[PDB]
Amino acid sequence: HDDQDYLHSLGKARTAQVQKDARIGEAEAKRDAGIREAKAKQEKVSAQYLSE
Amino acid sequence: SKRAFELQKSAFSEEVNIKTAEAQLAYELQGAREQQKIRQEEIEIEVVQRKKQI
């Protein structure tokens, strides 16, 4: 046990190093979802106006 | 796409409004054309009257 917080920072380093991966995965997923969601939105609006 | 749709819709609205604007006032045009003869006879009334006032 350490009451001086000596080892807590050493532990927290790796937690940050894994949280960066946790965020990179979310960024990948969000960009990949948004790109094709916006594209499909575009096609449906274009077809709706073509019908109009 | 929105620009193309708006342009086509406004273009169509142009001639539809033109045809309507003709449609309301055709009534007044024919009404005046008929009022010509209506008043012609309404005034021939007293022409005939004054002809035999002689």
Swiss-Prot record, chain A:
Q: What is the name of the protein in this document?
A: Flotillin-1
Could you say which protein family the record assigns here?
A: Belongs to the band 7/mec-2 family. Flotillin subfamily.
Lineage here is: Eukaryota, Metazoa, Chordata, Craniata, Vertebrata
Subunit comment for this entry?
Heterooligomeric complex of flotillin-1 and flotillin-2 and caveolin-1 and caveolin-2. Interacts with ECPAS.
Q: Give the fragment's position in the full-length protein.
A: 155 to 206 of 427
Q: Which residues carry this modification: Phosphoserine?
A: 9
Chain's role: May act as a scaffolding protein within caveolar membranes, functionally participating in formation of caveolae or caveolae-like vesicles.
Q: Where in the cell is it found?
A: Cell membrane; Endosome; Membrane, Caveola; Melanosome
Curated annotation (Swiss-Prot), chain B:
Summed up, the tissue specificity of this protein is: In skin, expressed in epidermis and epidermal appendages but not in dermis. Expressed in all layers of the epidermis except the basal layer. In hair follicles, expressed in the suprabasal layer but not the basal layer. Also expressed in melanoma and carcinoma cell lines, fibroblasts and foreskin melanocytes.
Cite the post-translational modification comment: ZDHHC5-catalyzed palmitoylation may be required for the formation of higher-order complexes and for neurite outgrowth in cultured neural stem cells.
Q: What is the annotated localization of this protein?
A: Cell membrane; Membrane, Caveola; Endosome; Membrane
On subunit structure and binding partners, the annotation says: Heterooligomeric complex of flotillin-1 and flotillin-2 and caveolin-1 and caveolin-2. Interacts with ECPAS.
The UniProt function text for this chain reads: May act as a scaffolding protein within caveolar membranes, functionally participating in formation of caveolae or caveolae-like vesicles. May be involved in epidermal cell adhesion and epidermal structure and function.
Question: Family assignment?
Answer: Belongs to the band 7/mec-2 family. Flotillin subfamily.
According to UniProt, the name of this protein is: Flotillin-2
What part of the entire protein does this chain span? 215 to 268 of 428
